[PDB]
Amino acid sequence: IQPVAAIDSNFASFTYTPRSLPEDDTSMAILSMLQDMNFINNYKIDCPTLARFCLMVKKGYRDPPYHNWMHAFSVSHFCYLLYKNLELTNYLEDIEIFALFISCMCHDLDHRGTNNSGSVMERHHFAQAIAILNTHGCNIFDHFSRKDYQRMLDLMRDIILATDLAHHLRIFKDLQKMAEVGYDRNNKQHHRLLLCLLMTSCDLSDQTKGWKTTRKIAELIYKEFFSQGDLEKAMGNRPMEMMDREKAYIPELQISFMEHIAMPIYKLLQDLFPKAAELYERVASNREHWTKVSHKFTIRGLPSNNSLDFL
Amino acid sequence: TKLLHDGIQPVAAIDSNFASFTYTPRSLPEDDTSMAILSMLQDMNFINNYKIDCPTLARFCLMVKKGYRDPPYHNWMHAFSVSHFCYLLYKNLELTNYLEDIEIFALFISCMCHDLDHRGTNNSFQVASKSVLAALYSSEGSVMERHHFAQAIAILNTHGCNIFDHFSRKDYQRMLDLMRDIILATDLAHHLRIFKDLQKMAEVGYDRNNKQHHRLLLCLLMTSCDLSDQTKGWKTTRKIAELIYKEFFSQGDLEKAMGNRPMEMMDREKAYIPELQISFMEHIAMPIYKLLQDLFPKAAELYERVASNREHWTKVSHKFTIRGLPSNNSLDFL
Numbered sequence: 097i098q099p100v101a102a103i104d105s106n107f108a109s110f111t112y113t114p115r116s117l118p119e120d121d122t123s124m125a126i127l128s129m130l131q132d133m134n135f136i137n138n139y140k141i142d143c144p145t146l147a148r149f150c151l152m153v154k155k156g157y158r159d160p161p162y163h164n165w166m167h168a169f170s171v172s173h174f175c176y177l178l179y180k181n182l183e184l185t186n187y188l189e190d191i192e193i194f195a196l197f198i199s200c201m202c203h204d205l206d207h208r209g210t211n212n213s214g215s216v217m218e219r220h221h222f223a224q225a226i227a228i229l230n231t232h233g234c235n236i237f238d239h240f241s242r243k244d245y246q247r248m249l250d251l252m253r254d255i256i257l258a259t260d261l262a263h264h265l266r267i268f269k270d271l272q273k274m275a276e277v278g279y280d281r282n283n284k285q286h287h288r289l290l291l292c293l294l295m296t297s298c299d300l301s302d303q304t305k306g307w308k309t310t311r312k313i314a315e316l317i318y319k320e321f322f323s324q325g326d327l328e329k330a331m332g333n334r335p336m337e338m339m340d341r342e343k344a345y346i347p348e349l350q351i352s353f354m355e356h357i358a359m360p361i362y363k364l365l366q367d368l369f370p371k372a373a374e375l376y377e378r379v380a381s382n383r384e385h386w387t388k389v390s391h392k393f394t395i396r397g398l399p400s401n402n403s404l405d406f407l
Numbered sequence: 408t409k410l411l412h413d414g415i416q417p418v419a420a421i422d423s424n425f426a427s428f429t430y431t432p433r434s435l436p437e438d439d440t441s442m443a444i445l446s447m448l449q450d451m452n453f454i455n456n457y458k459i460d461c462p463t464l465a466r467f468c469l470m471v472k473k474g475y476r477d478p479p480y481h482n483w484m485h486a487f488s489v490s491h492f493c494y495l496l497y498k499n500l501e502l503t504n505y506l507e508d509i510e511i512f513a514l515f516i517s518c519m520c521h522d523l524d525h526r527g528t529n530n531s532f533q534v535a536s537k538s539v540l541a542a543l544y545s546s547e548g549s550v551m552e553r554h555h556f557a558q559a560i561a562i563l564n565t566h567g568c569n570i571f572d573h574f575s576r577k578d579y580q581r582m583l584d585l586m587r588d589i590i591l592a593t594d595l596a597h598h599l600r601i602f603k604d605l606q607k608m609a610e611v612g613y614d615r616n617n618k619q620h621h622r623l624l625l626c627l628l629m630t631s632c633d634l635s636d637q638t639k640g641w642k643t644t645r646k647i648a649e650l651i652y653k654e655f656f657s658q659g660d661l662e663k664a665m666g667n668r669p670m671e672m673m674d675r676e677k678a679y680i681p682e683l684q685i686s687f688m689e690h691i692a693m694p695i696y697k698l699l700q701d702l703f704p705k706a707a708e709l710y711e712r713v714a715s716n717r718e719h720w721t722k723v724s725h726k727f728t729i730r731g732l733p734s735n736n737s738l739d740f741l
């Protein structure tokens with residue numbers, strides 16, 4: 097197990113882009129992150145069991161454009177960053193933080209590049225995580241107490257279910273209440289709410305990097321959406337505007353996504369942790385950048401085709 | 408050999424709609440266009456009127472054709488299409504009630520010759536590129552149009568190509584002065600200078616005894632022929648627009664490579680085609696055909712087709728906004 101400093105000198109920084117790491121080194125980096133957060137020694141995890149677990153999780157992702165292993169790795173890496181930079185041990189229990197990180201690895205297992213059209217996919221993701229744990233040689237919790245095994249499973253379920261946007265919108269009022277009155281380490285409701293907020297923060301973490309990352313991730317997202325839309329047209333159904341490559345206008349859809357979903361998540365994170373202010377400011381800056389390049393979705397000159405036949 | 412040994416077709420046998428304003432001369436295969444030129448001159452009666460030697464005329468037509476290059480728009484098929492429209496104006500507007508036979512003959516020959524040796528580049532490009540044409544003609548203005556005329560003159564003075572070598576001294580001179588004036592009238596700068604005069608003439612009415620009115624009418628008709636692609640269906644205007652912008656953006660690329668800053672309409676990174684087409688059509692094309700309508704009521708269908716083609720450019724404007732991902736399938740262009 098590599099020390100985390102040897103992977104990259106900037107590995108624990110919010111400026112690091114985990115998609116820069118070759119896919120063949122990501123399994124080792126997972127182990128290095130668990131080592132550096134001290135969960136392997138804390139919970140006495142068998143290293144071979146953990147290695148096999150991590151490879152099975154990786155293997156359980158398919159290869160659609162966005163919802164693949166590198167997404168899961170990136171999300172997991174952001175959880176690590178929150179641990180390292182926001183001092184999560186002052187707010188949550190070690191078992192809750194451990195659950196969040198394992199959930200990050202597992203939260204989109206067996207995604208097909210298609211959406212829920214509750215929480216159909218998120219329940220499947222959890223069921224896949226459970227099936228991996230009950231595979232021979234992969235149960236990283238098989239030495240946990242009956243109390244702790246149960247808690248771990250309940251946490252993973254709650255945290256993975258919190259990645260459904262529908263869940264986040266139900267609890268949004270509660271998150272705002274918590275942010276304004278202030279976090280209370282003795283309130284078990286606040287722990288639940290904070291774990292949901294942190295999970296969604298990890299899931300959308302590509303929005304906190306530079307322009308190069310948001311642009312590429314947007315491309316991959318729309319590639320998935322339009323594939324789904326193509327399939328829905330082939331079956332005789334009528335896809336949503338954002339799934340239809342002939343009707344979707346990307347700048348409007350991105351700016352909506354960023355104003356209405358991403359920015360309020362990181363605004364809430366900022367209100368609870370002042371050291372997350374740079375995260376919110378990067379998301380806001382990335383949204384400004386989407387507005388600046390909007391004009392480029394009007395074809396100037398002739399299309400690359402070099403033809404006007406498309407009229 | 409093929410132009411000679413096929414005799415001169417009657418124009419009805421080329422197509423039953425050949426003399427109609429709805430006919431698209433770009434439909435005719437390029438290998439039949441030389442014969443169609445002869446058929447049009449035959450049907451307007453200029454061959455018998457002026458006693459043109461047919462072999463001389465056949466060789467003249469092939470030399471004119473040969474004198475066009477192959478840029479996207481300014482090629483032989485443009486010249487043929489412009490000449491065909493002149494024929495249509497003769498057939499449909501009864502031009503013999505307004506102009507002399509020699510003026511009408513000059514207009515048609517000018518139509519064939521008016522873009523000779525065009526390189527897909529405009530007048531200012533010759534000056535910016537410091538081409539041989541600029542060296543010869545830049546102090547006089549209308550650089551390309553002067554070259555076109557000089558090329559026509561060089562064809563006439565090629566052995567076996569002088570269709571006017573049997574003209575009187577008076578008529579030879581008149582013909583040359585007409586071709587020069589008419590070809591120079593294809594410069595947009597010329598048209599904008601005379602526009603006030605054309606409007607005057609349209610409102611007071613045409614006067615067959617006013618020699619200034621003949622000059623002005625020949626300029627108007629020449630520009631009407633030059634822009635005649637705007638009077639056909641949507642399929643023609645769309646395709647011609649494509650060819651025009653191809654030429655413009657090639658020129659713009661060349662101007663960037665020399666360190667100069669091209670006009671917005673020449674710059675493929677700044678030109679927004681719907682705005683430029685609509686401007687061209689509202690400000691250049693439509694007033695030309697409005698003036699033609701004011702002088703000849705039977706040209707009303709021409710103006711109405713140009714206006715309808717402009718409405719069509721407005722309807723499809725929205726399609727220049729990229730929906731979904733580009734064909735690229737990539738967002739790298741941001």
Ligand SMILES: COC[C@@H](NC(=O)N1CC(=O)Nc2cc(OC)cnc21)c1ccc(OC(F)(F)F)c(F)c1
Nearest residue numbers: 259260261264296299313314317338349350353357
């Ligand atoms: C299928 O969506 C996957 C993911 N979307 C995402 O990353 N992006 C990024 C982007 O750049 N463009 C986008 C455009 C868009 O529609 C216009 C939707 N989503 C995105 C996502 C996960 C969990 C969520 O739930 C919660 F936010 F609660 F975590 C959530 F909302 C969204």
Ligand SMILES: COC[C@@H](NC(=O)N1CC(=O)Nc2cc(OC)cnc21)c1ccc(OC(F)(F)F)c(F)c1
Nearest residue numbers: 593594595598630633647648651672683684687691
């Ligand atoms: C190099 O120009 C060639 C020709 N242009 C033309 O046909 N098109 C057609 C089109 O579809 N789009 C256009 C757009 C545009 O600006 C964006 C300019 N021109 C065009 C032309 C010849 C003589 C002229 O002078 C006069 F009109 F007076 F005859 C004249 F103005 C224009």
Ligand SMILES: [Mg+2]
Nearest residue numbers: 203204217259
């Ligand atoms: Mg998901």
Ligand SMILES: [Mg+2]
Nearest residue numbers: 521522593594
């Ligand atoms: Mg010209």
Ligand SMILES: [Zn+2]
Nearest residue numbers: 167203204299
């Ligand atoms: Zn995810």
Ligand SMILES: [Zn+2]
Nearest residue numbers: 485521522633
């Ligand atoms: Zn022309």
